[PDB]
Design a protein around this nucleic acid. Structure first.
Ligand SMILES: [Mg+2]
Ligand SMILES: [Mg+2]
Ligand SMILES: [Mg+2]
Ligand SMILES: [Mg+2]
Ligand SMILES: [Mg+2]
Ligand SMILES: [Mg+2]
Ligand SMILES: [Mg+2]
Ligand SMILES: [Mg+2]
Ligand SMILES: [Mg+2]
Ligand SMILES: [Mg+2]
Ligand SMILES: [Mg+2]
Ligand SMILES: [Mg+2]
Ligand SMILES: [Mg+2]
Ligand SMILES: [Mg+2]
Ligand SMILES: [Mg+2]
Ligand SMILES: [Mg+2]
Ligand SMILES: [Mg+2]
Ligand SMILES: [Mg+2]
Ligand SMILES: [Mg+2]
Ligand SMILES: [Mg+2]
Ligand SMILES: [Mg+2]
Ligand SMILES: [Mg+2]
Ligand SMILES: [Mg+2]
Ligand SMILES: [Mg+2]
Ligand SMILES: [Mg+2]
Ligand SMILES: [Mg+2]
Ligand SMILES: [Mg+2]
Ligand SMILES: [Mg+2]
Ligand SMILES: [Mg+2]
Ligand SMILES: [Mg+2]
Ligand SMILES: [Mg+2]
Ligand SMILES: [Mg+2]
Ligand SMILES: [Mg+2]
Ligand SMILES: [Mg+2]
Ligand SMILES: [Mg+2]
Ligand SMILES: [Mg+2]
Ligand SMILES: [Mg+2]
Ligand SMILES: [Mg+2]
Ligand SMILES: [Mg+2]
Ligand SMILES: [Mg+2]
Ligand SMILES: [Mg+2]
Lengths: 146, 100, 124, 54, 114
RNA sequence: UGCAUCCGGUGAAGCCGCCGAGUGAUCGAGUGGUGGAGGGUGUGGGAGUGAGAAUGCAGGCAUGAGUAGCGAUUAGGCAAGU
RNA sequence: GGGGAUAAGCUCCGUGCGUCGAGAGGGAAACAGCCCAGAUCGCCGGCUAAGGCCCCUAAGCGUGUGCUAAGUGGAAAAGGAU
RNA sequence: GGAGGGGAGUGAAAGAGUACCUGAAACCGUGCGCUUACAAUCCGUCAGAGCCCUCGACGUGUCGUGGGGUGAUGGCGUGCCU
């Protein structure tokens, strides 16, 4: 019998990650890995082992190429011809957090356990957060050289 | 103090005084058996190299022989009139590790 | 000698119902349609009785990768070094250790790294 | 039209689950020396002493 | 465990669901409120149920001799009984078969000290 | 059906559970509760011998559902009585 | 290869062709017929084929050398272009 | 009001009361334990926490070659016969 994690025995932790001048894709991938908890060696798909990750200053996120005017986030309200058209520039101008939020919702397991994990992520626009009472630990994403 | 015993093509982490379920192996219940080792741990120090793995010994005594629980088999191919059934019950041996 | 067909039929009726015990709605009530899902559920039993080994090995590998990265090494390198050192422990025990004794996992990863040759890009 | 199938036991009973009766709170009136039970619908007539209560 | 007296009316001429509708209003209440709700609940099913509860209270008082004011409906339920079956003509000559339902009424009242 | 002949009102068959065993159809001198009169080891023998389907047959009960309808164009209210 | 227009998931032949039919498994999302490969049963063991190794999803966000600015990659021609 | 019913008695038995041996399954209830009101679907199987109850070594709950009931959540998953 292998190991499966208990209900409350699982442990969380808080990290804050600035997004200034960070590549959107790489930041999203690292955030999703940490969110699901794959870094932890207690990972078990049925029960999340992730950590509350808080993203700060999300308006300065950067993307490669000329995407800044040719990325096309989509959605449809629900009625015929209710298709909605938007670009990264407009999205950042009007509601920034949505960019990273959509990026990571795409990565998370689209089942409901993933819909839940989605909760434990929070993204802000400016370099400040009312979550200062949880002592988040700065977490700069790095690669294992090889 | 837990060790890894390579038996029945498997390996298990077992502590002294523990009891394990391993495949059937010809031996009268109540006798004793010795096995090569794949890893031994005592607090901090760890023995891992295959040489020490094969040089140390694990001793345990067989408790009883067990036939597992019924497991049914049901092959079937829709729309083609193939209907195949068969039961199976594997025999297992239970060990109570003694010392390392 | 006409044989009245009562007991025989009821025996198998009840046996199938019992084997179906605990299914949804009428599906544990109507024999004519319990059979459907007795047969199905057992087909799934047959298939997943092997699917389970694949899934569990997947989970073990994932845990091992997590542990190696937390110990600053990639799972494939851990496996390569471990083999090159000629260890005979498998990934089930690897995972159980990695979640039970991080110290032993650290020792094992040091063994793997040390057994790791100098140059990894050597054509030889 | 018609149904395509049987609606599950659970579905029928769920639809039924909100069709039930309700019980009100009664009222007593002290008239003629007796206290009888009348919904406040009747309270003034009860006091006056003409309401046909057995 | 408290002394339970039971009283039921079988083959009584009403639909099971239509009796259960009334019955749900009284389950678990004390006999006083049971009587009040039954009498002031204008449902034809009420009359049979009120009859049965009165009979049960009388049964408990007479056979067992327990104070009515201490009685609360322990359990109550209605089970479909045998159904009279009739044929009723319908247009284009085709005959459709009427299922005249009938349900039993069981009401057992127990004693619960204040 | 044949049999050495036995099982049983100290509870047969049947019904509903539980346990264990066979690779299967199952089995249990295996039992718990109802039932209150017959079953039958073994070895043969003979079969109206094994049901999910056939818009099958007969019986019972489902759902649409407490829904549609309550069968005209004349129509009632009230007093008092049972 | 014939026919069709070198169109059809078209039709008609040959294949000591292959597969499905009468074949479960993995890959191409899904997909019998395309790719890998033959399911006696069980094992919470290991090595591999095709296909893959950033996340959904297991595996290098690998090594070194070059190309691309087109999201080409991730549907297409005649032709045109410092 | 009767129908109907509960006592008392008959009887071995009235869960044998004339709708009367046995009373099964569909079917409809009561109660009990558990699940469920951010959840997209041949309704299960593989994992699987929690809660409920059960049992033995061991104190107030922890272990133990533990069980049954439930099943939060996730992997796979397109009924059957023709
Ligand atoms: Mg066939
Ligand atoms: Mg279930
Ligand atoms: Mg009334
Ligand atoms: Mg007897
Ligand atoms: Mg008996
Ligand atoms: Mg008996
Ligand atoms: Mg009897
Ligand atoms: Mg007989
Ligand atoms: Mg014979
Ligand atoms: Mg014979
Ligand atoms: Mg026949
Ligand atoms: Mg039949
Ligand atoms: Mg058939
Ligand atoms: Mg039929
Ligand atoms: Mg209907
Ligand atoms: Mg209407
Ligand atoms: Mg109407
Ligand atoms: Mg008329
Ligand atoms: Mg050709
Ligand atoms: Mg053709
Ligand atoms: Mg073949
Ligand atoms: Mg195939
Ligand atoms: Mg596939
Ligand atoms: Mg084979
Ligand atoms: Mg998926
Ligand atoms: Mg992965
Ligand atoms: Mg590579
Ligand atoms: Mg690199
Ligand atoms: Mg280069
Ligand atoms: Mg393209
Ligand atoms: Mg082009
Ligand atoms: Mg040119
Ligand atoms: Mg007597
Ligand atoms: Mg009858
Ligand atoms: Mg009888
Ligand atoms: Mg529930
Ligand atoms: Mg909820
Ligand atoms: Mg979905
Ligand atoms: Mg489904
Ligand atoms: Mg699935
Ligand atoms: Mg699916």
């Amino acid at each position: 019998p292998t190991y499966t994690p208990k209900a409350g025995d699982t442990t969380r932790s808080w990290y804050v990650i600035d997004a200034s001048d960070v590549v959107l894709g790489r930041l999203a991938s690292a955030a999703a890995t940490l969110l699901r908890g794959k870094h932890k060696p207690t990972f078990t798909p049925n029960v999340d082992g992730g950590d509350f990750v808080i993203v700060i200053n999300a308006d300065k996120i950067a993307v490669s190429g000329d995407k800044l005017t040719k990325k096309f986030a989509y959605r449809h309200s629900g009625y015929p011809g209710g298709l909605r058209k938007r670009t990264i520039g407009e999205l950042l101008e009007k509601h920034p957090t949505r960019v990273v939020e959509n990026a990571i919702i795409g990565m998370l397991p689209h089942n409901k356990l993933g819909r839940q994990i989605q909760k434990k992520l929070k993204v802000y626009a400016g370099p400040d957060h009312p979550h200062a009472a949880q002592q988040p630990i700065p977490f700069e994403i790095k690669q294992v050289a090889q | 103090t837990y060790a890894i015993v390579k038996t029945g093509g498997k390996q298990y982490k077992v502590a002294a005084g523990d009891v394990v379920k391993v495949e059937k192996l010809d031996s009268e219940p109540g006798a004793s058996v010795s096995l090569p080792v794949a890893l031994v741990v005592d607090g901090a120090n760890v023995t891992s190299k295959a040489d020490d793995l094969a040089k140390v010994a694990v001793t345990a005594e067989v408790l009883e022989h067990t036939k597992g629980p019924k497991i049914r088999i049901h092959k079937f191919k829709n729309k083609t009139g193939y209907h195949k059934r068969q039961g199976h019950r594997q025999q297992l041996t239970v060990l109570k590790v003694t010392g390392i | 000698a006409r044989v009245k067909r009562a007991l025989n039929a009821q025996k198998k009726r009840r046996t199938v119902l019992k084997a179906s015990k605990g299914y949804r709605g009428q599906r544990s009530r109507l024999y004519r349609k319990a059979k459907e899902q007795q047969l199905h559920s057992l087909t799934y039993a047959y298939r997943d009785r092997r699917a389970r080994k694949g899934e569990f090995r997947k989970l073990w590998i994932s845990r091992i990768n997590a542990a190696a990265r937390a110990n600053d090494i990639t799972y494939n390198r851990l496996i390569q070094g471990l083999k090159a050192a000629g260890v005979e422990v498998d990934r089930k025990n690897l995972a159980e250790l990695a979640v039970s004794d991080p110290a032993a996992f650290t020792a094992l990863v040091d063994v793997a790294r040390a057994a790791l040759p100098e140059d990894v890009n050597a054509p030889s | 039209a018609v149904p395509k199938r049987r609606m599950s036991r659970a579905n029928t009973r769920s639809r039924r689950a909100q069709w039930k009766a309700e019980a009100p709170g009664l009222v007593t009136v002290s008239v003629a020396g007796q206290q009888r039970k009348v919904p406040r619908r009747l309270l003034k007539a009860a006091r006056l002493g003409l309401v046909d209560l057995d | 465990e408290f002394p339970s007296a039971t009283a039921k009316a079988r083959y009584v001429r009403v639909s099971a669901t239509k009796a259960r509708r009334v019955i749900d209003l009284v389950r678990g209440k004390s006999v006083e409120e049971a009587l009040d709700i039954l009498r002031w609940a204008p449902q034809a099913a009420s009359e049979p149920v009120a009859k049965v509860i009165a009979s049960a209270a009388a049964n408990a008082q007479n056979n067992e001799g327990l104070d009515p004011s201490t009685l609360v409906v322990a359990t109550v339920y209605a089970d479909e009984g045998p159904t009279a079956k009739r044929i009723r003509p319908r247009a284009q000559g085709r005959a459709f078969r009427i299922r005249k339902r009938t349900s039993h009424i069981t009401v057992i009242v127990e004693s619960r000290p204040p």
